């Protein structure tokens, strides 16, 4: 995809995590831990449910048409209803080929965006007290125990505790 | 400084191919077939009103040949015509084949009016072996076949018939082909004979062709098969010196006109669809399907791939 998590600096995904689409494994003194992410998870749902529903949106409703099968060869009317016909499949065949196409595009593009956009917003609540190791993983560089790491993924960490400690530790 | 968190997506043991802009082989977590291959073996009498024909094809319906009593009165939004149905009467064309069955299906009704012909000295109700009714011979109940009086006599016809009425009218009319000129003399007189039906602003004329065609249940004359619409304030003369055809009244039209047919040898069922092809009805939400370009109700749009999977998750990235 266009950020590169997904497939990227992420290098797989995650088969114990059964109830949600993104989310935190972590490791601590006290042990390890993997939490599913609602945002993230909602979000990239809200949207491929969102493409599906345009999908199902529309009507194509038809009684009265043409004829489209033959028993013999009648020559010129015969022709143009044939070649109206096959005109029109080849056209909505396209269509349905083509939109196939540009939608898995979109999904895995916005999938991996919202990949990005989970991996960005803990960078931020982390500041100055975190360092990123390069595979979706911060070491975080004070202690962090479990009330802590669950602050972090309820997005209540509030860095200024830990900064003083945090910097120590990266610095000198 | 030491603890750890990782931020991570999630992934299953097998997922599904999809195809992209730029590959055609990608896997996904979950996918979504959009392509409906699968059919009922059946038809659904609902919602739609379907019609069988049975032995009847609707030319026959509307001629009313032995055995269509059945389609008297009948509604549809879908005719159901049947390719085994069998010609039970006179042999006949229909010069414009086609546009007459497709008038009939698209009305969607067989609302008959009778109305009675006060025609000449010739005799009415001609019969054939080859429309047999119980054995008894017999002919297409819309019709009423004219033949010379008893008294050697076959008159100019000249009727008419005036639509005050709301709706327009359908009238199915023919000119008999004899195969030898002993036999239009026989039955007519006159040779040749000829059928001129007018409105006020159209006519049809008809000149009857003499000669042995093959044998058709134990027949080699023919009928031609004509139509003639009547709006309101309009209407309708008819005038012959033989081999006319009469009609014994009219097909009521609606104003709007919304129903079709569809050929196929399936079933009618006990399900519930909208949505039928000449296979059998299609149940399904996918926007494609492959089964047939013949196709009737709210359907999917027919397309030529078999298979079109839409992604519904993520790459599915393992282990
Ligand atoms: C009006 C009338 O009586 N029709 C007679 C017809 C027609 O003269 C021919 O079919 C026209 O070709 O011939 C019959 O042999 C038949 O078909 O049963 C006897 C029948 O009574
Ligand atoms: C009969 O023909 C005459 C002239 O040929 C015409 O004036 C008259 O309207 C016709 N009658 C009917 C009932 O068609
Ligand atoms: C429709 O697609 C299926 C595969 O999904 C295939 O087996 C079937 O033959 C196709 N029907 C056609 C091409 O009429």
Redesign the pocket.
Known sequence: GLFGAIAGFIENGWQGLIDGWYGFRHQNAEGTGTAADLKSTQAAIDQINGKLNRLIEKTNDKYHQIEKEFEQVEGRIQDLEKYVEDTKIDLWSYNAELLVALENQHTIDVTDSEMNKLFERVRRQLRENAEDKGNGCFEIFHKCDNNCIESIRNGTYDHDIYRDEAINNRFQ | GNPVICMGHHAVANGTMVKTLADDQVEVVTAQ?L?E?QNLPELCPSPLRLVDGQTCDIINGALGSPGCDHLNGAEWDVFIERPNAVDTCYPFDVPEYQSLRSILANNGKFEFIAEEFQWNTVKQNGKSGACKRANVNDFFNRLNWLVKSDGNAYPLQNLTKINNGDYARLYIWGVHHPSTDTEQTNLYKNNPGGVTVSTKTSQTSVVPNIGSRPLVRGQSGRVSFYWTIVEPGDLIVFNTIGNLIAPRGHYKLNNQKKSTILNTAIPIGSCVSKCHTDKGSLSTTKPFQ???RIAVGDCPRYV????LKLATGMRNIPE
């Open positions: 077939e392509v291959s492959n089964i047939s030529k791939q078999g298979s």
